[PDB]
Ligand binder design. Structure first.
Ligand code: NAG
Ligand code: NAG
Ligand code: NAG
Ligand code: CL
Length: 512
């Protein structure tokens, strides 16, 4: 029953809640992030999640073709989701590549980031333990910034392609290809492990984090807000994307997950449970990582807002620092990186299988099992690897950060979600959906969610977008570097490559 549904949904938590949420909550202050986080959650997250589940269940088609009989004129939501999930597959596998590199470098007796007496460290390096005794730098951040991937002075100098990371990325892609070769999703007792290990790892990390000194400052920074920061659109614009990324909203996956359920199945309670559980695990992981970050700041004796990198690498700077202090660091490090690989992989298979099925639905005659689908999967993996080689070279962090900020976040996700809510609440109508639910499942849901879809989400999205446009600021990596105009143009081209799908399909349909 409930144990079975939690066993099925154990794959809900992924690299999102464990990695992306911390650095998004850290880039622009922690306390000023929770208020728009929860506002956007209860305004759009659970509403749009439930909406995707209902559309996938009511209509047997799940994905691109769900909108074919709801509103054909707005069919571009599926294409936008396909483009967004393709870019997501492009830049998501790099996190797994870094995790694999750490796993391979963690088999040694002494962890590489324990000390910085190595051949890739400047003399200015100092051990953070002895730091309290404007040019010093902790060993972990220096290691992550040079040995893991060397940083050029800017994006204008791509440098030379790295080889060890390329090999790790190729290994991960080959593992994914050879696992989709057969398919190991159908599991018996293994689903118990695949659902218990991540939670146990997170729980022991939580215990370690809040049992460490200096966690109080991290908790206060995470919770206590700053009203003045709400005056900048960055906090709202990234709080309206982190919660959408966590639930895989608008990625075309949740609109097809509900297609497996039958007509008479109470999906309301399941959707509420998964949403609340995802929010809770994200919140507790935030406590853990901000506690370890506060401990890092306490030993480093520097301001919390700049103690660590304010970019995609926050997890790889906090979590290894946490497992370093745990007894027998090698064992816990190996287990943790296996956990990261398991979660990120499972997300990678769902993101990929969804994309492949969605694109095959476009041309069903081209690929009907056999070997043509096999070579198509091989081609997709090869092209994704080649494209991902761009952000793994020397100074590859800038391309990755820009592509993450402008690919599956920022304005594209809010754009897709706003049109989704607008069409569902202004052509199909919330009353019609409640009538269908009432005649479909037991109990009539409260009128809260129809008002939600009608007002709370579209107003929030439009206001955030316009408020960002008026107070336009360039995207900056970390806090001391500024992109050139052409880099921002490239990022905006990336975002438009997703956003323009809806107007393009609209005008094509209006032509005939
Ligand atoms: C050299 O590396 C060892 C290994 O951790 C370390 O204990 C020692 O402090 C380092 N010495 C210098 C001068 O970096
Ligand atoms: C600072 O360095 C000196 C020199 O080794 C050492 O004696 C002292 O214990 C250090 N201070 C702390 C707080 O460890
Ligand atoms: C250290 O940082 C300061 C700025 O705070 C800078 O003026 C100085 O050149 C840097 N290097 C050294 C060796 O002090
Ligand atoms: Cl989240």
């Amino acid at each position: 029953k409930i144990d079975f549904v939690l066993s099925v949904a154990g794959g809900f938590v992924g690299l999102g809640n464990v990695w992306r949420f911390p650095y998004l909550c850290y880039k622009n202050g922690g306390g000023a992030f929770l208020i728009p986080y929860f506002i956007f959650l209860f305004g759009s997250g659970l509403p749009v999640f439930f909406l995707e589940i209902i559309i996938g269940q009511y209509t047997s088609e799940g994905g691109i073709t769900c909108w074919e009989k709801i509103c054909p004129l707005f069919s571009g939501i599926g294409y936008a989701s396909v483009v967004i999930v393709s870019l997501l597959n492009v830049y998501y596998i790099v996190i797994l590549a870094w995790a694999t590199y750490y796993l391979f470098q963690s088999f040694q007796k002494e962890l590489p980031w324990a000390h910085c007496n190595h051949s890739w460290n400047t003399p200015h390096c100092m051990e953070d333990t002895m730091r309290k005794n404007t040019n010093f730098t902790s060993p972990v951040i220096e290691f992550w910034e040079r040995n893991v991937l060397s940083l050029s002075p800017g994006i204008d100098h791509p440098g030379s392609l790295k080889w060890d990371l390329a090999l790790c990325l190729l290994l991960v892609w080959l593992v994914c290809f050879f696992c989709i070769w057969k398919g190991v999703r159908s599991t018996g007792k293994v689903v118990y492990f695949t659902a218990t290990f991540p939670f146990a790892m997170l729980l022991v990390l939580l215990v370690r984090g809040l049992t460490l000194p200096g966690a109080g400052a991290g908790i206060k920074f995470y919770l206590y807000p700053d009203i003045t920061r709400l005056e900048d659109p960055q906090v709202w614009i990234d709080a309206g994307t982190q919660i959408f990324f966590s639930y895989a909203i608008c990625l075309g996956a949740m609109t097809s997950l509900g297609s497996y359920n039958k007509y008479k199945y109470n999906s309301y309670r399941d959707c509420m449970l998964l949403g609340c559980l995802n929010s809770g695990t994200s919140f507790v992981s935030g406590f853990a990582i901000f506690s370890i970050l506060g401990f890092m700041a306490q030993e480093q004796g520097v301001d919390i807002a700049d103690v660590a990198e304010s970019g995609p690498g926050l997890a790889f700077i906090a979590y290894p620092k946490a497992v370093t202090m745990m007894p027998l660091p090698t064992f816990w490090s190996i287990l943790f990186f296996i956990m990261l690989l398991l979660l990120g992989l499972d997300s990678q298979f769902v993101e990929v299988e969804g994309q492949i099925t969605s694109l095959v639905d476009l041309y069903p005659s081209f690929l009907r099992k056999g070997y043509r689908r096999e070579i198509f999967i091989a081609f997709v993996c090869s092209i994704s690897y080649l494209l991902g080689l761009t952000m793994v070279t020397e100074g590859g962090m800038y391309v990755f950060q820009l592509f993450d900020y402008y690919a599956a976040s920022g304005v594209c996700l809010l754009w897709v979600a706003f049109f989704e809510c607008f069409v569902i609440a202004w052509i199909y109508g919330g009353d019609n959906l409640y009538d269908g639910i009432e005649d479909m499942i037991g109990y009539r849901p409260g009128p809260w969610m129809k008002y939600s879809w009608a007002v709370i989400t579209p107003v929030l999205c439009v206001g955030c977008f316009i408020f960002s446009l008026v107070k336009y600021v360039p995207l900056t990596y970390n806090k001391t570097y500024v992109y050139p105009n052409w880099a921002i143009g490239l990022g905006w081209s990336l975002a438009l490559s997703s956003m323009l799908c809806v107007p393009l399909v609209i005008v094509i349909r209006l032509c005939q």
